Amino acid sequence: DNNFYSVEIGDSTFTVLKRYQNLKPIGSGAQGIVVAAYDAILERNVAIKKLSRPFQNQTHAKRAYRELVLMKVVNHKNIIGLLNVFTPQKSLEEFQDVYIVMELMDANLSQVIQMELDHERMSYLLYQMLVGIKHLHSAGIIHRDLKPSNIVVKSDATLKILDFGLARRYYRAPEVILGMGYKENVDIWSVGVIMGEMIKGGVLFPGTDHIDQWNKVIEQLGTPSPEFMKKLQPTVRTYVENRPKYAGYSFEKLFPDVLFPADSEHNKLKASQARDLLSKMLVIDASKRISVDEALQHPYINVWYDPSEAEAPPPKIPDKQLDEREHTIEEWKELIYKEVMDLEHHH
């Protein structure tokens, strides 16, 4: 009859094109809830993320908007695939919800961390993160929020990043968490943490809590330098400058051989190279931390290096949208609506 139809998953309603069936809840990636479904026209598993009245507020609207524009304009093997977008309401008047349909991967990295990988697997997964990140950066998009739960893998060892809901807790770069002002290598810190976590097999800086992060961090890495302290917001400085001061530990002591798989047949795929790469990523002072190009160029990673993966044409944004500009509840709704209407096409 009407194209759409309605399913209750516990308290939530998914109103979606009829092609999408047997929905199952799969998670709550940041700013919406997500379901797996069977797509009967493609004959294919997909994931459907619902953004409920995304225009409700300043925060959400910006994010939904960013996520909408970039999902369209960014296509790459290592960034999650866009399949469809829609709303079931028939007008700007009546408009409430946005649905984004995506490929369904098999797992998120949190699972991979738990398991014993060999060097080609870790390296290759990290290579994939980095190539994805480089694609985003080439367009001046900085992700700022990479973590295990927004990076997904398949049983054929492919890896894709999702989210640019935040794209413009110890996973975030210190420069971010200290309102410091930041460049692209903000994302390298995150990769450092995730790499470390893949090697350790669990949480890198054990809590308990979102700010017992920091302390375990400086206890582990060492307190950062004076110049670095200088750069801080005078007020936030004196918090940081107060802490007991620590030397930190070498990377040999933080990531000893025992934690690594056997060295591989291949020269560059060894504990000492991984540890080297780590110690250039997992670095608190961003201006001493390596870039995505150097990390791609690094011996531990560069074995996979493929220029046609790593050097694709940038996504292009209208930069008409630079979207820092405060808008109002009302205008957001219009902006997102046009963005959705423009995207809509497949049913």
Partner: peptide
Amino acid sequence: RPKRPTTLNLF
């Protein structure tokens, strides 16, 4: 030199 991995066990 090394082949890209093509399997990853997620069971």
